[PDB]
Structures are given as structure tokens and as C-alpha cells.
From a paper:
[name] is enriched at the [name] neuromuscular junction (NMJ) and transported across synapses, and disrupting its expression promotes both synapse development and structural synaptic plasticity. The capsid layer is composed of the Copiagag protein’s CA region, which contains 2 alpha-helical domains.
Our purification protocol enriched capsids of sufficient homogeneity such that we could determine their structure using single-particle cryo-EM methods. There is a layer of featureless density lining the inner surface of the [name] capsid that likely represents the RNA that comigrates with the [name]-gag protein. Because the RNA does not adopt T = 9 symmetry, its density is amorphous in our reconstruction. The NC region is not clearly visualized in the map but is located in the interior of the capsid and is associated with the density attributed to RNA. The [name] capsid is much larger than that of the T = 4 dArc1 capsid (inner radii of ~220 Å and ~170 Å, respectively), resulting in ~2.2× increased internal capacity. In place of the spikes, the [name] capsid contains positively charged pores at the center of each hexameric or pentameric sub-assembly, similar to HIV. We found that [name] capsid formation requires the presence of RNA, as removing bound RNA using anion-exchange chromatography inhibited capsid assembly.
Residue numbers in the entry:
A (entry chain H), B (entry chain I), C (entry chain F), D (entry chain C), E (entry chain A), F (entry chain D), ...: 3 to 186
Write the structure that this text describes.
Amino acid sequence: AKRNIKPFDGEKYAIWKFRIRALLAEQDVLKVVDGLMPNEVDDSWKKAERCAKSTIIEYLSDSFLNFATSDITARQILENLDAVYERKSLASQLALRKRLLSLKLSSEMSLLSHFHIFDELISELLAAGAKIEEMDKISHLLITLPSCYDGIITAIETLSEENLTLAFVKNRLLDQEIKIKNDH
Amino acid sequence: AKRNIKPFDGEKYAIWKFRIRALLAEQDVLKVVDGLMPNEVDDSWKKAERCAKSTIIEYLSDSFLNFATSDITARQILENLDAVYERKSLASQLALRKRLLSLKLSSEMSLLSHFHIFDELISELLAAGAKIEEMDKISHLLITLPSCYDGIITAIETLSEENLTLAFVKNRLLDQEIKIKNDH
Amino acid sequence: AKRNIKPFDGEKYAIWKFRIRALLAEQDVLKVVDGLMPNEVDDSWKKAERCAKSTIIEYLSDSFLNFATSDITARQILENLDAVYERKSLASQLALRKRLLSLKLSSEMSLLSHFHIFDELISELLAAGAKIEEMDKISHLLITLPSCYDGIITAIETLSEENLTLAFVKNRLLDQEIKIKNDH
Amino acid sequence: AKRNIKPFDGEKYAIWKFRIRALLAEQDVLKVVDGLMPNEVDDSWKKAERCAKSTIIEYLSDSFLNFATSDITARQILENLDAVYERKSLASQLALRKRLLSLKLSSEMSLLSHFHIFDELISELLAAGAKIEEMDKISHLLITLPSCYDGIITAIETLSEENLTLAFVKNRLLDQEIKIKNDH
Amino acid sequence: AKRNIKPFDGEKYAIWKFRIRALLAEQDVLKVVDGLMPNEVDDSWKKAERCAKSTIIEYLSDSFLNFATSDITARQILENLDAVYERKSLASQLALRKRLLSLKLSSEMSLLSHFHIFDELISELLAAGAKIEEMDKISHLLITLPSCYDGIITAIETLSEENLTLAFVKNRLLDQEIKIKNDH
Amino acid sequence: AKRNIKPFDGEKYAIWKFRIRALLAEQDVLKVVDGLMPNEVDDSWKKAERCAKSTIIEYLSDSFLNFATSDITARQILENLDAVYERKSLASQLALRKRLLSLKLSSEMSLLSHFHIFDELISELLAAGAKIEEMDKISHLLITLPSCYDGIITAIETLSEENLTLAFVKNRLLDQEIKIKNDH
Amino acid sequence: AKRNIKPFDGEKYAIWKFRIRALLAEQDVLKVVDGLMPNEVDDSWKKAERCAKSTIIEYLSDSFLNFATSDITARQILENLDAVYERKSLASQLALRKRLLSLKLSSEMSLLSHFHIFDELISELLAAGAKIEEMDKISHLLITLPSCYDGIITAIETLSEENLTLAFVKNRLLDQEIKIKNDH
Amino acid sequence: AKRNIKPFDGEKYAIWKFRIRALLAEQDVLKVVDGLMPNEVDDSWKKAERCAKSTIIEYLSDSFLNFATSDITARQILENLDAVYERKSLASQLALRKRLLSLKLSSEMSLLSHFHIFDELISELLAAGAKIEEMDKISHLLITLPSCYDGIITAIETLSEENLTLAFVKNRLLDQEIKIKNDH
Amino acid sequence: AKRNIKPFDGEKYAIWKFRIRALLAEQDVLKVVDGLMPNEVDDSWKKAERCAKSTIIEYLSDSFLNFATSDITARQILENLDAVYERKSLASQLALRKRLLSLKLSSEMSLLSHFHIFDELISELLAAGAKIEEMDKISHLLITLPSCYDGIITAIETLSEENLTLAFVKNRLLDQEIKIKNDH
């Protein structure tokens, strides 16, 4: 169907799963993976069962084709992929925290790009089962900033006391950014 | 309409066969390849045979169309392809096992390529008629790894208690590989 | 009576408040601070209030006597001190999260002192109302460990995340510490 | 009873007087100094008077008992001590203003001890009779700080007036100087 | 009551716990920690619990007050301190035994300091969960002394054993040190 | 009871006597020293006698115990100490006057210590039996000041001698002094 | 209550025992040590036993706290300390005698301190079960004197041995002392 | 009660005995030491004896406990101490008189210290079996002065020898000292 | 019949008298010397008088035979011998003990001679009336030994705690000094 779905090669599994779910819902097939099992099978509940399986097999890389083996239903294929990939794994959380602590701003990349990278990494870490509160997100973001971003954040903690949100600090940081570039 | 199935060109026959089988099952046609030959043949079987033959011919390379030039049903076409490119040879099995047990991971060559090599070898073993169980596959993969991974090998073989699978072990080895690369 | 209570010089307000409350409860005087103000006052209540206020003034450093110059009962003194200090500003919480995420094991310091520091860090972060799951504590404790702990970390990561408690992790880490000191 | 009150040595009269008053209130003796003279004096009143006199003499330095040599009540001793160390002398107020404005922080100096110096200057200046409010106090404290604090001082002076208290700004300066010594 | 108990700050937990238990026994409060939780909403029981908690907090250093910040029973605090400072780990016992077997003695350091070192090692080995009797204690001690003490170690070991105490051996060795001091 | 009273070592008898008298008054014992001996003695009077004698002996230096070795009451002990150390002597007070007329303020030493020296000198001169009026004290204070005070010394004498008290002139001298250091 | 008692650390057990006994008798507690065990125990006897045990534990050093680990009363602890430290043994008294023979008088130290030291030595020797006749004390005194006392020792040895008490020889030696110090 | 008494270390026994005697007099206990033994002894006598023994023991240094270890009343303890430390021997008196006859005034040392010196000299002479009245003390003082006092010594000798007192002659000598200091 | 009694020669008279009295009692004749003179003399009495006179004559030396030449009864002879030697001290025990304590082993002089000398010295000490116990004799013999015997000394005091006599310790010392003379 839609060719925008990159074949699943074991990376960014949540993105591939969301794309597959959206495409299945597009053809009125998503009900198979998350629905109610009828006590007896019907013709309507006979096509979507295998249509979803064929769709999943279509958008899978060659190595991962073993997840079906022509005997596992489409729901259970995704269930197995979930049990192997979207698992709350402590190793993934440690790796994500280690890489998060390594984020440093460089003059050769834009501030918005760094915001996007931070947001995606935070979302991935949240997917790893760990719980992060908004203030913890902000603190993780701030330690990445360089020394030039000193006065702005100090004013942030001193003045703001209740509007302390990731969106607000992002807005303040980006608004401050132009004053550095023209200053060099 | 599933264009992700690369037409067969004499290489990687198992994946092509699996994709073909999935597509055939999608269109309510695989029943004529797996099952029996009912004495009362009617339109339900004739149309299925015609659709299967058309799909096989379309998804085969022009040079490989010789396998279905004559009036041969899809079942015998698949039988011939199995007999020609999935030949059961015990000597081939022994040679494959000798080469697999001698496989080792080189420093300059990444874990993904080693995994692909192991996957193609195990696919050849299964094609050669050798019956290999998944824990045997896990053992074969772990014995061809350097000493730097010894710790995770011991941890997986002893501390892990759930039902081991190839993908899970591959994920853990990938995590160890990236951790080592950060270390080195 | 109890002479171990350091007079409040403006730091560790919770500790000083807890010690003062314990001392007042020892002489059965904490009832005035905590219990409701009786509609009719008697000699016992007046004596208890006088003794409580006297103890508060006695164990307060000279720079903070201003909190007691106003003719107010010990209840108002403690309430004012709570309003001034029993609150976590944005700066305090961000510094807490920074020092947690920037925590590292020094060479000379053993696991006992490091674990004590980590525990008090969590407690004072918990004192700010920041809910933290045991997984987050385990991850924070693992990231601050040096590179010589890699094997035990990898072993721990393979456990099921149903019995993973902080205490078991600390025990295994101390066991690894014994061997590391042996291997030096 | 309490031995925490250092004997009055001509310096920091306000703290000594406040602690003596608190101690007298502890033993229910402060009524002699503050309460009106009863028309009829009983055993209880004379006992309280002699106890107060003994307590004040005990916590007074030897050279300062010339005030008490005349057989007069402790109330008059406190009154005369107030008259001779708490006087409305304008020249003193001007000189202390001049020294307070010239209170630039030194590098080899701790902000807690700087706060103590400022607090003692303010207390003795109020003893000199010049009334200073909390706004004037915070302005005086902020003008003493070096230029490295300019960001937080600007931020806090942009804050609303109602929540501006000396303790609050002291906490903010402590929090920011934590970063200052961190950032070196 | 008893002042001799040094507040606990993470060193020699056994002595502190023993003295704390003795102090609780003085006030007849050991029933709270040692009883089979005879909870019968008794006011005497509540008073004993409060007194035990107050005494435990009293002789705890400010760093470790987090162990009793929560509203947990005195037995709860004691068992927490036990679990964190007396860990039944076999590797620690083995390392301690290896150190003991290679203790020996210095060339200038006097018998009292060696006795303190041996006592500390034995105490922490008992805290480690190793069952050791006084005969084993003496045997371990006697095998660390130089050749100048052979005459006394042989003499004491040929003794009829039965009722002999470690302190008696210490007294004999102190007398032997006094005697040998006059010559060397 | 009160341990602030320096043991009497033959120097500065008056303040030591005052402290002893105050301590006796606190325990309701001074009635022995000053109150008339009752015609009939009772247990309470004897207890007060013994307590006074013991207190006086306690707060005396060892060299001076001879004054109480004789079986005499506390009143007799104090009378003997008075007759020996506060005796009214002519040559003594002439020497005291000569020293006062030779008293000059040193540059390093501030008016507070100068005022204390003058006060104690005048007090012991009065004890010597030389009647001195307030204006005489004022003249002595004015004539013992350096040349930098000339403006204030000439100014103060112009005032009418009807309300010129020592406190007023001392306060004015301090107010002038704070200007004097300012011009240095 | 009395904090002058040095905690017992293995030196001079007799003073520690005497001080502990005196303190126990002071609080009306020594009856549990010397008085017979009552057939029935009341709350008073239990409280006295606990107080005695706690007091003994308080004045015991950390190294010797092992003497009271077991559930034993004050009597058992005291008798164990006696059996280990005041046992009447040959080695105990032999060292005492050897030091006594080495108690030579020093030039700077007068015979009062010498006699006191010798008296303490004899007392502790008697505590060691070495019954010493008064003449033996006298002889041990004389052998410790320098050549300047030859005349007096020759005089004393000629004296008849029926009423020769140590006090008489002490007085004669003191007279000889004063005569010698005259002749210098 | 009285805690200024330095524990007896073997020196200045007169002061220690006097202070102990005064303290016993405070508690109505001195009647045991000085009063005769009643034919029948009641509970009050037993309490007084016990308190006297306890007070004497507790103000004794550790080295001197042997003087009270035996079952001897406080009277026996004091008698033994007096015998061992104040012996009524003629040779002591003769040596003391020679020194006392040669006690001149050093120029650098004032009359107060010399009077003190003569005081303990005459006190120790009185301790021994010497009978000296006030007149011999006066004569000894007058022969122990330098040539500058010749006028006052001649004048004081001319006065009638019935109203002369030590205080009077000391006062005149002090006045003469005051006069002489002005002349040198 | 008892020829074990040394004839009296003017020394050790008390021993001779005691042995004579014991012998006379053994012969049922002591009633003559001790019992009262009967009013009428019987053949038994005169026979006893003759026997006692002859016995005493037998155990007198020739030089002292003059005491029995006169026609006097045995009672008169014994009374005269008492009047001449009943109370006289045998020798100066003081110098004897001083010699004993000053005894020291010399290298050339063999251990047998030292044992002999110590033996007779203890012999006069006992004979002159001084009471010495076995332990005291052992201590005296040990303290006069060099440092080369220390090992056997420790062995004796440790092992032989209940089996100690002069004979056994002397035997062990001889056994040890054999080897010691071998090791020189």
C-alpha cells in the first residue's frame, strides 16, 4: 500500500509499529491485532486476519521474516515483536541515560536540531519503561547547554516558579539563541 | 500488487519462497499448495490454480520461467524449485557444519555482518535438510564470538530463565557490542 | 537537654526541625506545637509553651533570633521557619538533579559512603516531592559506577525486572567490590 | 540554666539582651522587667526580682557590673544598659551608613560569614536608632555583592515585592554561589 | 541517660548497637525491639516505642538521620541499620579469613594496637556471619606473633583448655611483652 | 550554684563581694550577712549560716582561706575582708588622686576601655573614703582626654551645671569620637 | 552520675571497681551486687539490676564490652572481671616484686611521693594475693634508698623487732631526709 | 555540693582538708569527724558517716584511694592523712624556724605575696608541734622587712603590746609600702 | 630418746626451749615446770624432777652446764635461762632480708651454690621468727635470677600453677640451666 513505511530492520521499532498500526486502521484491518476474539470465525473475520499478516510480512526485512513462520497469526507476530523489542529493559535504560549525559551543544548544529534530538531521545527513554517528570526532563536538557547559556537559565529559575514547563523553557532558550549568534 | 517480493534470480531462495507463500495465503490460494487434491474439482480450485500459476510466473525471473513453461500446476513448480535449490545432501550438511563451526568474528567486521553470515549459513543448513533447533542455533552463534563477550554469554546461559530466542540473544549481543565500542 | 542538636545556622533545616521536634516530644512538649490550641489555657499549657519557646530560642543561632523577637508562640516560630525553609525552589531542585546526574565514584571512597550519599540524595530529592521509581534509582546508581563494574552490571541487566530490588543490587555490587579490591 | 548566652562584653548587645529576656521568660521572671510594678510586693515578686538580678549579673562580664553596684532592681539595670548601648546618635547612624555602603565582598570570604557581617552591621545600626525596612536591607545587601552575581541580582530585583524577604534572597544567593564555586 | 555512646556515623556499628541496646534495657524498652510485636494498643507500649525512637535518633549522626526520617518503629530502624551494616556475604568472610591468616605483627607496633586490629577483624567477621568460638579466636590470634613469644604461646597451648578466656590470653601476652621489653 | 564568679585573688574585691552577695540573695541566704541576728536561733537560720559560710569558702582562692579558718560566721568573714581590703585610708586615696590626675588616653585604646578604667578608678577611690561629686567626675573625665577633643571639652563646659550628668557627657564624647576616627 | 570514673580499659582494675561500687551504692543500687539474690523478684529489684548493668556497661571501654554481651547480671560481669584481672597468681606478683626492687629514689622527687608510690605498690601487691608482713614492707622500703641514708638504716636495723611499725620508720626517714636536705 | 575543691593529689593538704571540712559542715556531717562517738548510734549517725565517707572518697584523686579502701570511718581516713602529711616533729619545726628567720623581702615581690608566704610558713609551723601566738608572728614579720621600713617598724614596736593585731600591723605596713613606692 | 635437739650453747634459745618443753611433755614431766608445786612431794614428783633435771643437763653444752651445777630444780634452771635469753632477738632480721633481696646470681658461681645460699638465708629468716610462705620463697628465689631463665619462669607460672613447691621449681631451674650452660 503506502511505501512510506520503511521495512523493519530492528531499529526504531516504535515508529514501524505505529506506521503498521496506522496502515492497518487505514484498510479497516487494525481490529485484528487489538480486538475481541469471536467464538466462531466469519468471512468478514477471515480476510483481515490474513490481510494484516501479509501486510506485516510485506514491510519486514528478510532477517525478521522468521517471526511469522506461516503459522503465527498477525496479532501474535506483533505480540512477539513487542515481547522482544518494546520491552522495559534495564540495559536499554542504562544505555539511554549514558548517551543522554553525553549530549553537548556544538556551534555546527542548530539549537532546534538539538531540541529535536533531545526530545526523541527522551521519548525513546520513556518507551524503555522509565518514568521521567517534566522537571527531570528540563534538568536533563539544561546540563547539555554550554557556558553561554548561564544568565538566561538563572533568570528562569529565579523568576519562573509555577510555569516551569518544557515548552516554556524551550521557548525562552530559543528566544535567547539569536542574541548569541549575533554576538558570536 | 506486493512489489516488495524481489523476483527470484537464483539467490536467496528461501525468503523468495516464504514471501510467495505469504502472498498466496493472502489471496485464499495457498490451500491448493498445502493440503490435498479433492476428487470434485470445481471453479474454486480452477481459479485458485490459475491465480497461483499467474503469480508464480509473474514473480519469477524471465530466465527462470523454464520451470513453468509447460502445463504444470503451481504445486509441481514449487516441488521442482525445492528439488533444484533446496537439495537434501548429507555431504552438503557436513560441509556446512564444518564451515559454520570454524566461523569466527573478526575485529574489522561488524556484528551485523557476522549476524547476516550466521543467518545465511543457518538458512543453508535448514535448506540442506538438516534439522536444527533454536537453542542449537544460539549455541552456534555464541561459540563463534570473541572473549570480549564472554560475560554476556555466561549471563545469558545461566542467569536468563525465560524461553530464549534468537532475536533476544542478538539484541543482547548488539547492546554489548555498542557498550564495548564506547569502552574502546 | 539533648546537646547533640546543632543550632540552626541556615543549613539542613529539616534535620534541625526533626531533632527539635524529637526533643520537644521527649519532654512531652510537642503537644503544644502539634495539638490544637485549647479554648481555655491552664498553667500546664502556659508552662509547656514557655518551655517550648525557650528551647527554640536556645537552639537557634544568633543570626536567626529575628524569627523569635516578635511575641509569638513556638507554633508561629516553627510555622515561619517552615514557610521560609520547608519549601524547594526551582534552583534547589535543579541543583539536586544536576548533582544526581553528575554523581561519580571517586577512587578512594568505598561503596558504603557512596551508597550513603546516593541514598541521602534520593531522600532529599524525595523531600522535594519528586516521585522516583526503583528502576530509576537502580539506573542512577549504576551510571555513577566506574568501568571496573562492567561484568556485574551486565549480569544484573539480564535479571527479570520483577525481583530487582535496590538492596539486592547493593549486595551484588559490594560482592564485586570485594573481588576488585582483591584484584589490586 | 542555659549556658549558651555568652557574657556581654560590650559587643552584640542586641543578641545578649534578647537571650537574657528569653531566659527570664523561661523561668517566668520577665514580668519583673516588663510588667508594671505591683502596689504591694509579695514573696513571689521579690523572689522573681532577686532571681532576675542574679541571672543578669551571672551573664554580665565583670567590668560591666558598675551599673548594678547600686542596689537597684534588674529592670533599671536593663534600662540603663539600653540607654548607654541603644542610643539615638545620628553621627553613629551616618558612620555606619558610610561603612555599610563600602562593604565590597572579598574573594577569600564565605557568603555565610558575609551575611553575618551584614546582619551585625544592620542590627547595630538599628541600635543606633536609624530605622531600616526590609527593602532597604535587601538593597544594601545586594549592593555589597561583586559583579559575578549580576544576573541573579537583576532577576531578584525584578521579582515582586511581597515575596521579597532577607532569608529568601539569602537562600537564592547561596544557591547561585553553589554554582559559582562549581563553575571554577 | 548514658553519654558514653558515641553517635553512630558509620564506624564500628557493633559497639554502638550494643550500647544502644544496653541503654534501652536501662529504661526497660528492649521489649519493643525484641518482643514478638505484642501490639495491644497499650499506652505503655506507645510510650516505650516513642522513647526508643527518641533515644535512637538521639545517638545518630546528622548524616544518618535519614534512616529514621520515616515513621518506622525502633525495631524497624535497628533492622535497617543491621541489613546495611551487617551483611551476610560469604565473599567478605573469605577475604576477612585470608587477611587474618596473613596478619602477623609489625616490628615496632605494640601489642595493644595489634590486639585492637585483631579485635576489629574478628568483630567484622562476626558481623559478616561467620560463627567463631573463643577457642577459634585464641587459635587465630596465637598464629600471628613473632618468635620472641614462642615460649608463652607453647605454654598456653599445652594448658588443659576447658575454661580459658581470650582476655586471659591477652593478659598473659601483655605480661610477656612487659618481660621481653627489658631485654630487646 | 553559679560558677561565673571568679575566685577572689586579692584583686578587685568590690565586684567579687557584689557577686557573692547576689548569689547569697538568690538562695535567700543574704539575710545572714545583712539581716540582724535573731535573739533565738532556729534550724533555718543555722542552715542559712552554714550555706553562706560554705559558699564564701568555695568562691575564695586557696591563699585567702585563712580569713575563714577561724570559727566565725559568714558575716564576720565578710567584715574582716572589708576591714582589710576596702579600708578607708588617706595615703591610698591621695595616691589614687595623683594617678587620676596623671591618667591620659592612649591612641590605640578606645573610649570604652578608657571609660571603664575611669569608672573603676573612681569607684575604688570612693571606697577609699574620698567623697566625689558628679561634676568632679565630669572634670576628671574632661581633663584626661587628648588635644583632638578640644572643641568638645570647651563646648561641654559652657553648658549650665544643673543637669549635666555623666551619661550625657559620655554619650557626647562617644559621638565626637566617632567623628574623630573618621578624620584619621 | 559521676563522670570522673575513667572507663576500664585493662589498667588498674581496683580503682575502677571501687569507683563503680561507690557509684552503685550512691544510687542505692549496690545491694544487687553484694546483697543476696531474693527468692522472689519485684519491680524494684529488676530496675536496680538494669540500672547496675547499664552503669557498668557505660563505664566500660569498647574493647572490653565483650564481657557483658551475654545475658548476665552485674554480679556475673564483676566476678568475671575479678577472675580475669585480680586472680592471685605467681606471675602477677612476680612482676610486682621485680618493679618494687627497681623503685629507686630519684634526686628531684621527695620521699613523700616516694612513700606514696611504694604504698600503692604494696597495696596492689596485696591485691595480688601476696600476703606481706609489715616488716617485709619496711625492708622493701629500705632497699630503695640511696647511700645518704646509711646511718639511719644501720640504726633502724639494730632496733628490736617487736613494735617496729612502718609509721615509725617513715617518720625517722623523713627526719633523716630533712637533715640531708639541710646538709646541701 | 561544692565542686571547687581540687582532688587531693598529695600536695597542699591543709587547703584540701579545710575545704573538705567546710563541705562536711555544710551538710551537718562534721559532727562525725569532730564530735565524740555516741554510746548508741542511730540511723542519722549512720547516714552522716556514710555521707562523710562518700564525700571524702569522691574528692580524692585516683592514686589515693588506698587510704579509704579499708573499712575505716572518715575520721580514720582524715587521721591517717594528717599523720602521714602533718607530723608533729621537732626537727621539722627547727628547720622551719631557720627558714622563717631568713625570709627577706625581695624587691620585685610586693607585700601581699610576702604576707601570703609568711602565712603558709606560720601555718606549717603551727601544723607541727610549735606554739606561736600573734605576738611572735608580729615580731617575725617586723624582722622580715628591708631597711626602708625602719621608721614604721620602730613606731609599731613602741605601741603597747595588748591591742596589737595582725590586721592592724599589716594595714600600717601596706600604707607604708604605698608611701615608699612613690619615693622610688 | 629424742636426740634431734641441738644442745643449747647460747643461740636460738626459743627453739631449744620449745623442743625441751615438747620432749618433757612427751615424757609426762612438763607438769613439774608448768604445773603448781604440790603441797606434799610424792615419789612420782621427785622422780619427775630427777628426770627433767637429767634431761635438761643432757641437752646443755658443757659451757652452760654451770646453770645446773647448783642444787636447784629444773624449774629454776629454766627460769634463769629465760631471764637471760627469753626475749633477746636472735639476729637483725632487717639486714637479713636486705641481704636476701640484694642477692644476685653471678656467672662463675653455679646454681647449686645459689640454691644453697638462698636455703640457709630462708633458714635464719624462719628461725628468727619471720613468717614466710612457700609462694614468697618461690618469688624470692625467682627475683634473684638473670634474664636467661625467663622461658622456664613463664613455663612454671603458666603450667605449674597448682603443683608449685620449692623442690619442683629448683629442679626445673637446674634442668634448664643445664641446657643454658650448653648454649655458651
